[PDB]
Amino acid sequence: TQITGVVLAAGRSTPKQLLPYRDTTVLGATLDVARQAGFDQLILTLGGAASAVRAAMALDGTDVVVVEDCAASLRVALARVHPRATGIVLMLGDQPQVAPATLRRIIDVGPATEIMVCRYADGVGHPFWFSRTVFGELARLHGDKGVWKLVHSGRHPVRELAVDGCVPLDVDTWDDYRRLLESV
Numbered sequence: 519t520q521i522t523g524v525v526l527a528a529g530r531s532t533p534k535q536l537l538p539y540r541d542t543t544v545l546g547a548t549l550d551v552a553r554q555a556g557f558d559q560l561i562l563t564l565g566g567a568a569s570a571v572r573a574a575m576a577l578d579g580t581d582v583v584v585v586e587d588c589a590a591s592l593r594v595a596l597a598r599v600h601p602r603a604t605g606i607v608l609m610l611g612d613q614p615q616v617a618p619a620t621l622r623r624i625i626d627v628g629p630a631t632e633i634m635v636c637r638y639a640d641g642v643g644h645p646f647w648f649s650r651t652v653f654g655e656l657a658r659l660h661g662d663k664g665v666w667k668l669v670h671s672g673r674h675p676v677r678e679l680a681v682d683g684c685v686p687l688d689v690d691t692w693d694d695y696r697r698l699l700e701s702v
């Protein structure tokens with residue numbers, strides 16, 4: 519069997535993906551973390567900033583999927599998932615603070631669940647695990663924004679992985695980016 523990681527980075531904003539962070543970029547930092555997790559396959563989704571991202575970073579070893587400018591980038595990423603993968607670990611391109619250890623833990627215990635989320639000190643957060651059994655439902659969401667409602671639904675047995683600290687910062691605004699740079 520296989521485990522595929524999916525990084526969603528198609529979010530509209532200088533592109534937010536290319537903002538400087540820890541000697542690299544925000545997206546570069548996220549991908550650096552994903553590359554350490556031991557995924558058999560890594561899929562990255564990009565939007566309108568695709569060309570800019572490509573020219574700024576080497577995307578070696580990652581399956582790049584491009585959408586137009588939330589968009590339904592998860593739907594098209596699923597099309598790339600290898601047949602022998604029993605599910606996906608889902609990560610967001612603007613959440614570079616995700617710990618490699620958390621990814622290894624969810625890779626370990628995630629496959630014994632239909633859906634798994636991380637339980638932080640201040641609530642539910644990424645990474646998520648989705649079993650192949652829910653790929654159809656994921657594809658039928660209007661956009662990437664619909665995942666949040668799904669992981670809080672009682673329709674599936676959503677399991678929780680306990681993680682120390684609070685939820686990684688989701689870098690959308692300038693205030694978010696300021697908060698990210700502050701913690702070092």
Ligand SMILES: [Mn+2]
Binds near residue numbers: 529612688689
């Ligand atoms: Mn975001």
